[PDB]
């Protein structure tokens, strides 16, 4: 169910005799048998887990923690990463470039793996057959196939009904609309071709 | 026993700027400009407007006993005109006549290495 691969890295317990098997998001350019340096005093290399508070500006970092102790919030999809714009020594925070092009400020004590997640450009080849889509969505949930609400029944959907086919009312749905009416465009500030 | 400053005259087109400030540059005084003493939309770069702006700047300069101030004249820079505005000479002459000590002139207009292609396109402006 994930286009990006999984990196299984075995760690060493510094407290007792044991070796911890960790599941990491597999970046690109990292190969099995290469040493992962997880910490703050490490060097800027692909696969390292240097916190954003100990790295300069402009570095590319994937799997960025939203808050310390969350252990993986941001940049978990294949071909995506996070760009750092700046940081402030007072009230330690890091400016990050979110994969959606959004702006978010998080603490400097958030760990992230340096590099880009492997499997980039996954959505470049169309799925062709319905079988590829069926196999793709079988491993995720029961969300396929999706039926149009305009070919529906009046009781089955607000968009259905009528001898002809038509949406009927405005497709845009207010944010404050109650559950059930949220069918179509939700809080659409603007529509049409971008 | 004299105190200096930076006036950083910004002689542009259709507007004139004078900004007397300390050498540090993080604290400034007398934000008066060419358009402060006129309402015409076309006489901002006129010598009279620049003279009035410098006179106001010089008057407000000696609030707590400021003696001298350095200047660094610059144009709009970038890739637009690369030449100082007509009001720059009138701006720097008005306060000098007003008793303000002037020195260490320095042409701080920015010049690029043929980058950031300017406004107009291939055939540019046509009149």
């Amino acid at each position: 169910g994930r286009g990006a691969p999984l990196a299984k890295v075995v760690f060493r317990d510094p407290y007792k005799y044991r070796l911890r098997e960790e599941i990491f998001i597999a970046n690109e350019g990292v190969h099995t048998g290469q040493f992962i340096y997880a910490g703050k005093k490490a060097s800027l290399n692909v696969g390292n887990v240097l916190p954003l508070g100990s790295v300069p500006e402009g570095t590319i970092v994937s799997n960025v923690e939203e808050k310390p102790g969350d252990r993986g919030a941001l940049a978990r999809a294949s071909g995506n990463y996070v760009i750092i714009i700046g940081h402030n020594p007072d009230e330690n925070k890091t400016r990050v470039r979110l994969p959606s092009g959004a702006k978010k400020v998080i603490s400097s004590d958030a760990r992230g793996v340096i590099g880009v997640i492997a499997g980039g450009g996954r959505v470049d080849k169309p799925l062709l057959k319905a079988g590829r889509a069926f196999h793709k969505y079988r491993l995720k949930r029961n969300s396929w196939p999706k039926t149009r609400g305009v070919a529906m029944n009046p009781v089955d959907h607000p968009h259905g009904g009528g001898n002809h086919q038509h949406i009927g009312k405005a497709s845009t749905i207010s944010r404050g609309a109650v559950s059930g009416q949220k069918a179509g465009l939700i809080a659409a500030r603007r529509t049409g071709l971008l | 026993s004299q105190v200096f400053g930076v006036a950083r005259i910004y002689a542009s087109f259709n507007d004139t700027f004078v900004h007397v400030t300390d050498l540090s540059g993080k604290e400034t005084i007398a934000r008066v400009t060419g358009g402060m003493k006129v309402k015409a939309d076309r006489d901002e770069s006129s010598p009279y407007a620049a003279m009035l702006a410098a006179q106001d700047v010089a008057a407000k300069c000696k609030e707590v006993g400021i003696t001298a101030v350095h200047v660094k004249i610059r144009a709009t820079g970038g890739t637009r005109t690369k030449t100082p505005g007509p009001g720059g000479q009138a701006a720097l002459r008005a306060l000098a006549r007003s008793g303000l000590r002037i020195g260490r002139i320095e042409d701080v207009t920015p010049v690029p290495s043929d980058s950031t292609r300017k406004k107009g396109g291939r055939r540019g402006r046509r009149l």
Binding site: - | L23, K26, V64
Partner: protein, 214 residues
């Protein structure tokens, strides 16, 4: 409207021992109230002064230094090297057509963990008894001259920390041995040095930076 002048104070800055002159002007600074603490905001500041002002002569007119403040102490804040630049009004003077321009760059380190971006400029001279018109370069002497000038400046900076690098930069003896060691390539007039840019810094390093004003 409140009065900013009554809400702000005056400060005095002293140049390092690299320059014999000490006072380099007067900076207007807001009062360091407990809510804002403007005293620590002065750390990230620079002051630009002319070498002629800092030396008392007139041959340093086309030279100036920006001087970054490091530590503040009772209206007597001291400063430290940030980087010098050749004034652009003068920098457009020695460059003319019908001659060859020479530009070399390095990323050489020093003895005090500083990193500098040193550049240099060299020309071709219309020699005495010349009848020619342009005296252009062969284009391969620049290839032969770029390596030696970079080598000679890198060996000079290496083994000498920042203090004597500045104390010998102000006299401008750097271009003194360029010409004589390269008299076999070109006449090589106007070998005035170019910008030095300081990129990465070590920590605050209390005490040693006081010696420049001790």
């Amino acid at each position: 409207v409140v009065d900013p002048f009554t809400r702000k104070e005056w400060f005095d800055i002293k140049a390092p021992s690299t320059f014999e002159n000490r006072n380099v002007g007067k900076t207007l600074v807001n009062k360091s109230t407990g809510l804002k603490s403007a005293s620590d905001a002065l750390k990230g500041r620079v002051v630009e002064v002319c070498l002629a002002d800092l030396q008392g002569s007139e041959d340093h007119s086309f030279r100036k230094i920006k001087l970054r403040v490091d530590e503040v102490q009772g209206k007597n804040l001291l400063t430290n090297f940030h980087g010098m630049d050749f004034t652009t009004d003068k920098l457009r003077s020695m460059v003319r057509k019908w001659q060859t321009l020479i530009e070399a760059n390095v990323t050489v380190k020093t003895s005090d963990d500083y990193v500098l971006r040193i550049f240099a400029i060299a020309f071709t001279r219309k020699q005495a008894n010349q009848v020619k018109r342009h005296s252009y370069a062969q284009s391969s002497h620049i290839r032969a001259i770029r390596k030696v000038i970079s080598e000679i400046l890198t060996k000079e900076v290496q083994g000498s920390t920042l203090a004597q690098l500045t104390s010998k930069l102000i006299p401008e003896v750097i271009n003194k041995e360029i010409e004589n060691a390269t008299k076999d390539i070109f006449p090589l007039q106007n070998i005035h040095v170019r910008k030095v840019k300081l990129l990465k810094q070590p920590k605050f390093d209390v005490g040693a930076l006081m010696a420049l004003h001790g």
